[PDB]
Each structure stands twice: as C-alpha cells, then as structure tokens.
Motif scaffolding. Structure first.
Motif, PDB file in Angstrom:
ATOM      1  N   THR A  29      -5.158  -4.411 -11.392  1.00  0.00           N
ATOM      2  CA  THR A  29      -5.209  -4.411  -9.919  1.00  0.00           C
ATOM      3  C   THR A  29      -6.585  -3.910  -9.513  1.00  0.00           C
ATOM      4  O   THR A  29      -7.065  -2.928 -10.052  1.00  0.00           O
ATOM      5  N   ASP A  32      -6.031  -4.064  -4.253  1.00  0.00           N
ATOM      6  CA  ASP A  32      -4.631  -4.374  -3.905  1.00  0.00           C
ATOM      7  C   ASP A  32      -4.190  -5.736  -4.444  1.00  0.00           C
ATOM      8  O   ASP A  32      -3.102  -6.183  -3.997  1.00  0.00           O
TER       9      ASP A  32
ATOM     10  N   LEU B  12      11.802  -4.170  -6.233  1.00  0.00           N
ATOM     11  CA  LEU B  12      10.701  -5.173  -6.277  1.00  0.00           C
ATOM     12  C   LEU B  12       9.416  -4.626  -5.635  1.00  0.00           C
ATOM     13  O   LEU B  12       8.326  -5.010  -6.083  1.00  0.00           O
ATOM     14  N   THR B  14       7.976  -4.649  -2.177  1.00  0.00           N
ATOM     15  CA  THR B  14       7.288  -5.475  -1.166  1.00  0.00           C
ATOM     16  C   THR B  14       6.223  -4.637  -0.439  1.00  0.00           C
ATOM     17  O   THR B  14       5.447  -5.219   0.360  1.00  0.00           O
ATOM     18  N   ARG B  15       6.094  -3.355  -0.742  1.00  0.00           N
ATOM     19  CA  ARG B  15       5.089  -2.502  -0.092  1.00  0.00           C
ATOM     20  C   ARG B  15       3.667  -2.587  -0.663  1.00  0.00           C
ATOM     21  O   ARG B  15       2.701  -2.503   0.059  1.00  0.00           O
ATOM     22  N   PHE B  16       3.528  -2.709  -1.966  1.00  0.00           N
ATOM     23  CA  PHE B  16       2.201  -2.890  -2.560  1.00  0.00           C
ATOM     24  C   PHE B  16       2.297  -4.294  -3.114  1.00  0.00           C
ATOM     25  O   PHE B  16       2.066  -4.541  -4.259  1.00  0.00           O
ATOM     26  N   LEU B  17       2.583  -5.209  -2.213  1.00  0.00           N
ATOM     27  CA  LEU B  17       2.940  -6.549  -2.535  1.00  0.00           C
ATOM     28  C   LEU B  17       2.111  -7.506  -3.240  1.00  0.00           C
ATOM     29  O   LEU B  17       2.661  -8.140  -4.131  1.00  0.00           O
ATOM     30  N   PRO B  18       0.867  -7.727  -2.844  1.00  0.00           N
ATOM     31  CA  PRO B  18       0.080  -8.716  -3.586  1.00  0.00           C
ATOM     32  C   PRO B  18      -0.025  -8.253  -5.031  1.00  0.00           C
ATOM     33  O   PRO B  18       0.349  -8.949  -5.932  1.00  0.00           O
ATOM     34  N   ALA B  19      -0.433  -7.021  -5.229  1.00  0.00           N
ATOM     35  CA  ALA B  19      -0.578  -6.465  -6.547  1.00  0.00           C
ATOM     36  C   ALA B  19       0.659  -6.512  -7.420  1.00  0.00           C
ATOM     37  O   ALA B  19       0.553  -6.732  -8.583  1.00  0.00           O
ATOM     38  N   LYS B  21       3.169  -8.670  -7.162  1.00  0.00           N
ATOM     39  CA  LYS B  21       3.886  -9.948  -7.012  1.00  0.00           C
ATOM     40  C   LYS B  21       4.451 -10.385  -8.359  1.00  0.00           C
ATOM     41  O   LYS B  21       5.552 -10.876  -8.342  1.00  0.00           O
ATOM     42  N   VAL B  28       1.267  -0.980 -12.183  1.00  0.00           N
ATOM     43  CA  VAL B  28      -0.010  -1.047 -11.424  1.00  0.00           C
ATOM     44  C   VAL B  28      -0.992  -0.028 -12.026  1.00  0.00           C
ATOM     45  O   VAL B  28      -0.582   1.108 -12.376  1.00  0.00           O
ATOM     46  N   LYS B 256      -0.844   1.211  -0.065  1.00  0.00           N
ATOM     47  CA  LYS B 256      -2.183   0.755  -0.510  1.00  0.00           C
ATOM     48  C   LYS B 256      -3.165   1.928  -0.476  1.00  0.00           C
ATOM     49  O   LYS B 256      -4.019   1.991  -1.378  1.00  0.00           O
ATOM     50  N   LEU B 257      -3.036   2.828   0.502  1.00  0.00           N
ATOM     51  CA  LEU B 257      -3.953   3.990   0.679  1.00  0.00           C
ATOM     52  C   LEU B 257      -3.571   5.187  -0.208  1.00  0.00           C
ATOM     53  O   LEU B 257      -4.457   5.819  -0.751  1.00  0.00           O
ATOM     54  N   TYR B 259      -2.174   4.827  -3.056  1.00  0.00           N
ATOM     55  CA  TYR B 259      -2.586   4.295  -4.383  1.00  0.00           C
ATOM     56  C   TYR B 259      -4.111   4.468  -4.565  1.00  0.00           C
ATOM     57  O   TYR B 259      -4.555   4.968  -5.608  1.00  0.00           O
TER      58      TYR B 259
END
Lengths: 285, 285, 285, 285
Positions: A29, A32, B12, B14-19, B21, B28, B256-257, B259
């Motif tokens: 990663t 993001d 699953l 859905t909060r740090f979603l793109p990463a 997926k 991560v 995202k922040l 992380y």
C-alpha cells in the motif's frame, strides 16, 4: 499505435520481505492504494489499452484488484457508500482489458517478456517494471513522451534518469556519446551493469520503462537467466536503440527506503489527504 | 492465567477501501510488515500463546503470514540471503499457536467472539480488534497491565482512552463516576454507543481491547445480530466490570489518516530505517 | 490457420452443486484428472496453440493446473517419483500458451466471448464450452474436422449432434433444410431454444463447439444477457453459417448424471486403469 | 465424552496426483461431493462437534466448503433454486464447529496430531485420516462402536481390517494374540510398518481411525520427524491399547482404483442418482 504493455509481476518479492511474504510486492500500500495501481494508471494515461500481467500462481490479488468483487460491492451498497462503490468499480476505463499469462519458473525479466509472446503477437509494445513508480509533474508522463518518440523514430526506447556520479555502481548504466536533454532521446550502444564509480559510460541509469518491437521475442528465444539487455544488444545488429531521458521522478518500491520515499511524496500530493498528511509530519516536532 | 486471545478479522473494511479491495485490511503495509503483526506482537509480549483468528474466506493471507512459505524460503536459501529468511520464519515464538474459525456472516463483534466459543472453552481470554494499533513506550504494554488487573480483581476489563469532548459523538463511551488515572481501572455501569456531544457519561472511548471471562459466551447466546456491549451489560448483573485506562497511544488503521500516523510514528522508530526515514522527512519541507 | 480458442469458464457451477461449491466445476475429477484437461487436450489436438480462459476470481485452480508448482515438484523429486513429475510438468506442449481474462459479471456466453476481444484481435477462433466433453473414437477429433471445414468454406461452424425425437425440447436445435452426414456441414438459418417435441426444425442439437470470425465481437457489442445465438443471427446478414454434425460422442458434466456417464465411459477407456475398472464393475454383481 | 476429532489434511497427495495437482485431494469429487464430506459426515454421525483440520496453505477450499459462500448463495436465491441452496448451507449441524491449524512442515501423522495440542487441550479425541472412506451398512458407524469401546475400557483404540496374507507387506499390522471379531476390540502390544509377507503378527491392517487420550500429546513431544506408532508404543508402557476390528468397508481414495470403487459403491446407493446410475452401468457391458 502502441496499445499493449507487459507488466512483469511474477517475482516473489525477496526485497521488501516481511511485507511481501504473504501478499504480492505489487499489492503493497502506497498512501491508500496498492503500488501496481500507479503503474497501470501511468500506462493507461500514455494510451495503453491492453495490460499484459506476466504473473505467478501466488499473485491472484493483483488480477482481483482490476476485476469486480460481488461481496464487496453489495456490502458497499447496503451501507449506501455509493461514491466509494463508484470508485472501486472503475479502477480502469471501459476500453482497457487486463490479461494474465504465467511465468512458469522465475528465470528473469527477458524470460518474463518472452512469456507474453502469444499475447503480444506482431504488435510493438511497452514494458513497465512495476517495482518502479514514476511521478510526472509536467502534465504529460514520460511513458507517453517516450512512446511518441518510438512512433516518430521507429527506434527502441530505454527510459533512463541522471543519478549522482558517486552512486553509478548501483545501476544498469547506458553507453551514449553525450546525454540527451530531459524528455529527449539519443542513440545508445549498450548498457553496463553497476559500472565502477571511476569507469561509467554516462550518469544515465536504466529505470525499467521500455518500448520495443515484436522482433524482440525471437531475439529473446535466441539469447546465449534469459537477459533482456542482450536481446536489446542483438537488436542493435539491425536497429537503432535510443535512450530516452525522463523529465519526471522515479521511486524504487522494491527497496524499503524508496518505498518510504514514495509514501512521503505521493502522500503529500494526495488530492484528498495531502494537506492533513503535511500537518501530521509537522506535528512530528 | 490469560493464554487465549480472540482477534476478530472477518470484516471486509470498506473504510480503508481502495487499499483493502483485494488484500485483507489486516495485511496492509505499516513501514515494512502487515498491520496484523503489530497486534499479534502486542498479544505475545503480554503472555498469549493461542491467537484465535475469527476470519473470512478472503483472509487466507493472514494465516499464511504465520505459516511457512516453502518456495519463498527455498528461493531465499539457494539465493544465500539468511537475514531475510530469519524475518519470515520466526514471526511468533515456537510455542505460540495460530488457529482459525470462520465467522460465517458479518453479525458484529459479539457474533465473532461467540464463533470462538469451541476454542476458548472454559478459559478466560483477551479480545484484540486488529484495526487499532497500540504503541507502548513504557516497556509494560497496556494489554499486559490490563491482564494483571483482570487476574488481581477478577473484574472484566475494557480498555479506554480520553477523546476531545467534541468527538464523544464517534465512539463507545464508558459510564464511569470518575476518570481512572493512566495505567489504572475503575468500576463501570455500561458503555453508550455515540452519545450526543451533550450527553456523554465520560470522555473515555472504548479502544478495542477487552479481557472477558469464559461465561460471556453463554450471555452472548442470549443478547437482546449480536452486540458485545449488551453481553457486557448482562455480565454487570452479577460481576464487577471495570474500565482500564491506557498509558499507550492508538492508531486507527481503519482510517486513512490514523494509518498514515502509524507509518510516520512506527517508521521514525524502526531500528534500521529509523534514521534514514527520519532523514527522508527532513529532506522535504 | 485457426490457432486461438476461447474457453468460457467463469460460471459458478450451480448445476453439479455440492461438488462445485468450493472448487471450479471445470476442476471436477473425471476418472483421475479434472474435466478441463479433456477440453484443453481436444483443442491442442485440433492445432490450437493459445488457450484463452474467460474466468472468475474463484477459478485460480484452473490456471494453476496448466502452470508449474514448486512445492509439488520438489515433493515428487524427494520421493524419486520421476515419471510422475514428468507427466505433471508437461500437461500442455511447449508451443501452447494459456491466457486469462476476467468476465467481470456473469452476463452469459455472448458476454464471455466478448471479454476475450482484445486477446482474439483480428484472428478467427474456436469456442469450447468446457462443461461438455467430446470423445472421438475415429483418430481425428470433431473440432479438427470442423476447423478444416471452416478453413475450406470461410463459413462459421456450429457443432451439432442427432438426439432422440422425443427429447428435442431439452436442447438448442438448429434450423437446416436436411441433416448433413456425420463429419459434414450444411448451411443453417437459426437455432430454436428447447422447441416443443411436436415442432422442432430438426433433431440436431447445439453441442457447445464453434469456429467464428473475429467480426463476431462487433456483432456481440451490438446485440439487442448478451446472447451468442443472436450475434450469429446478425452474422447471417453478411455470411453463411453452417451446422457441422459430430462423428464422436458428447458428455454433459454440468449435469450430475452425464458426469457419472463420462466417468464410466472415460474410466473404461483409461489406457492404464480401463481393464481393472471393468473388473470393479463386474464385481458389482 | 469424545467431542473433538483431528483430521490431518496437510499432505499434498502425490498418489492421486493429476487430479489433486491444483485442488486438495480431500476436495476430489465422489459422485457429487468432495471426499472430505463423507469423513466429516462419519465423525458427526458418531458424536463429534469440533472437526480440527491440521491443514496446508494450499487447502483453503476445504475450510470454504464448511463455510458460507456469499456470491453463490445469492446467485442461487435471485435464480430461485432453493433445493440446491439447502445442499450448500447446511453441510454440518449448526453446533458442529470446524477450526484449522497449519502443519508448518510434512513431518508425518504424529507431527500433525501434535500441531492440534493447543485445541485438544485435556480432552480425549478421535483421529480420522481423510484419504480413507469408511462405509457402514449397520446403522452404527465403526467410529461410534470404537468410541463406545474407548469410553467403556478407557483403552486407546486403533481401527483395523484383515487384509489378504500376501499384502501385509503394504500396511501397518497390529501385534495381536488372536483376531477380535467384527465389531470388537482386543489388547495389542504394537504395530509393525510393512512386515515382510513371512513375518506378520496378524493380517489386521491399521485403517486410519484412532481414539487417543490427551496424554499422547506429551508422548509425541518425546518420540525416538514424528511417528504416531512410537507414541502408541510409549503409551503401552502404562495403559492398555486395543485393536478395534471394523464391521464397515474401506476405500483408499488416495489410490486411483480405491477412489473408482468409492464412485461405484457410493453412487449405486445415492438416493436420487442411485437408480439412474444403476441403469447407466447396465447400458454398458
């Protein structure tokens, strides 16, 4: 003109090791999203239409990143996260296909490119090494500049970038008479693996971006650990080969410190997180 | 005495979603290793010997991270790179076991804990939510302090951390007469999910670390879709529950922040990269 | 001439359900190897060189079957099972590549074939539905007979097979003037889904073998649940389409009783197990 | 009393090799379902409630078979097919739990059992080798008889079955004074791996079903690469071990011919396909 790109992604990620142990190095990663997204975005924005992943049996999550996910989407709908579902539903445009072929054994980059022969057919094609990210700045990425030069010249392109004199023994280095200007090409006669700091033919390093003719596949079938650099040597026999010098910036994610460097540079540029990320850094003291 | 820890990892995210997926959000990358290794590390430095993963069909890579990887290990031996081989073969002490049970549907934290009933048996047990990273600078980790207290008091422990008054909105908040001091517990009557900014019984947020008796499993089969805070209420009608207030620092790796704050703070203090990373940051502003 | 074949293998295997729950329907064992092996063997022995699997994110074990497996091979060497390692190392010949593209959603056979557009390019190509096995007997398989007719005629080929009159409402049935001889073709004007036992245009059933021109992909982009049969209808506007009648025998593995029928017929023909398998059957009484 | 069963499934199975190249040999198709379902069935009809899979990184599909499959279930609901949906959602009773632990290397049956130590804890336990299918026609399965006997005698039980005299060569053989009758146990001094045709202490082969006390785990940490028959010897020096002689019939699904015998026998007696299958066979000779 150039519509195909080979992304050779079958390595086991020995570099960046704890992180790559149980996920692809390509799925690491960067802010993001996985590193690979940045390499596929670069390709597509230079007019690539067919992403040809040369892959390993352990790398399904790369193919899955560019496919739809039933359970993920219905979770996202049920929570009415509708803008998100729209983002993760079209990672690549409608006209871009992602294709898989297996590198059956890990016998190097030349062998990886040869594995895509059937899919490349008689087309001319780009090679993106995905452990390297290129950041553009200018509005036209180096891969697009470099493809157009290939179109114009019908000479193979090897992307290179000026490195410090005292660090040239870390790189494949090109043989050119002079160095070109940034965003320009010059004919090149060969590449030297890690030349001694005394004795480098130039300060121009091979970055891992290529535009090559289809010829190259019969050349790779006839190389003396099948080595791309000496398939290109063999192409010199009938063809001009030029070194195209980047206008942009590279990040080697294959190496833990150049990974941390991409996270810092991409993070600060994040169109949504950039400024909050800046604040986090300032708070460090 | 406290030897089992349940790590609910079936979500699953859905909060740090793109990463996340195509990889688990627990896999991560945090500097050079998946987020999960920091939580399993936390549990092991506090005396756990059975990590219980309550997992999803898409999380194989979590289990594989704590197993041996044959082609990777041999590739690394017959490429004579044994510092790296150490980094991937001894993630957990030989006596720490990792087992897994499937959470068949996403029915909340309480459903996940109850999925572990057949493995916890009669043992008391810790619960760690792997989206939250806890960093200790004291040399006794918050989870070890919290386990000491359980053993002493025999009172169920809920780890908590004060939040600004204008964000009590966002968290479970413990119903407590007075704030305990950093490192210490007091009795608690219940938790309130996202009390309005007006109406909070404290500023102490539920952080995602619990120590619970075996008997909460029976409670969890009877709650008024299964909520742990309800089972904790029921336990209240018989046993003292306490709020443990942490001395460490937290990072929500789900956001995202939070992380990116983990990547900065954990990176700055990496043994090796620490100094080089430190320098990368200076080379920016 | 015809070097490419599309094997559309992205179904979730609702038919043959307990067996296909957690492995591909294509990976269902028929005597001693997965069903797909028989379909790929048939293709390769009609001169196919590029196997184009249109696949689903759940179907990695199909790609893995035609790739090398490091751990499996070294287990086989260590036990000196050298003849076996040689068998499982060259399931397909040196000149045959296996390629993957994803059907992003399950929107039918026409949509599956369209997913392979980029890989098919301007080439003419075969379609093998892999839930159907064809057994040859004669020494030249029906797919090879049918490709040569395509080469000769430049007319699209739909493989068909005579079924009993009173069972025609189970099949797609072709409209032809008369029926051809076995191993021969006649022009056809359309196909009727499951016509009533009274009112069938012929007794000639669509088997799931096609040779089609590349044209078909722009036709599939323009079909009124994208339906191959009406892309072929549209091709009728500018092209002859012929029905090629099998000389061999089909087995529908997608259906539990036609699976059991293949196991019995292939088992008895097994060049190594056939006669011992016969004895097992006789012993039944 | 006997509520745990250890199913060692970490073996790659080079014996039914082509078929198990890319899927677990435990997921091999037996009429309409994977082989493993018949063994888990056997355990559950005999009173087990915790199936312990001692598994490999390549066996996810085994765990997924006993978990819920979201896209498959919904695909089946919004294609209104609910007989099929029953077949994949209730494989095991709601109170039967399936957990998994990784056998990190292939160090034999005894290493596999010892990997389950943290889950078995102090409980006595059954062991089932899933390559062997046991069929009962009596309505009390051999494993239930064998568990009755353990509870009565408190004597460790080893399931066995007489083999022709000229094949004692091929099996573990129990050292026993007299053959027990079908359905009954007697005391045993040890097992001999592949005694020469001359020198066998019985014709009773070890079949692959055991009932063992918790205390064999401690033994397994001390054996003279870990062999269960050695731990059983050590147990002999303190406790009665007995040989239980089965009344059911066996099928080695590891061998191509034992697997085809299972397909015939289990198929002939399938509720639905039984009669149709029966008929397919008659339509052959």
């Amino acid at each position: 003109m150039i519509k195909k790109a080979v992304l050779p992604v079958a390595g086991l990620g020995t570099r960046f090791l704890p992180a790559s142990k149980s996920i692809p190095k390509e799925m690491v990663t960067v802010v993001d999203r996985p590193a690979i997204e940045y390499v596929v975005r670069e390709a597509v924005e230079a007019g690539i239409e067919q992403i040809i992943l040369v892959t390993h049996s352990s790398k399904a999550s790369i193919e899955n990143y560019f496919d739809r996910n039933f359970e993920l989407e219905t979770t996202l709908e049920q929570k009415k996260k509708f803008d998100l579902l729209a983002e993760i539903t079209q990672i690549v445009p409608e006209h871009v296909s992602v294709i898989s072929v297996r590198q059956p054994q890990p016998l190097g980059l030349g062998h990886a490119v040869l594995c895509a022969k059937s899919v490349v057919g008689e087309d001319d094609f780009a090679v993106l090494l995905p452990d390297v990210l290129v950041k553009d700045g200018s509005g036209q990425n180096d891969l697009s500049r470099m493809i157009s030069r290939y179109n114009s010249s019908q000479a193979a392109q090897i992307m290179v970038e000026a490195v410090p004199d005292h660090l040239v023994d870390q790189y494949g280095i090109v043989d050119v008479a002079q160095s070109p200007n940034e965003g320009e090409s010059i004919a090149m006669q060969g590449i030297v693996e890690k030349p001694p700091v005394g004795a480098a033919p130039s300060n121009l390093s091979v970055v891992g971006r290529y535009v090559l003719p289809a010829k190259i596949m019969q050349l790779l079938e006839n190389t003396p650990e099948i080595q791309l650099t000496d398939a290109i040597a063999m192409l010199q026999d009938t063809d001009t080969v030029e070194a195209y010098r980047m206008q942009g910036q590279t990040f080697d994610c294959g190496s833990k410190l150049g990974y941390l460097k991409a996270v810092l540079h991409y993070g600060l540029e994040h169109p949504k997180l950039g400024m909050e990320f800046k604040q986090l850094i300032l708070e460090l003291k």
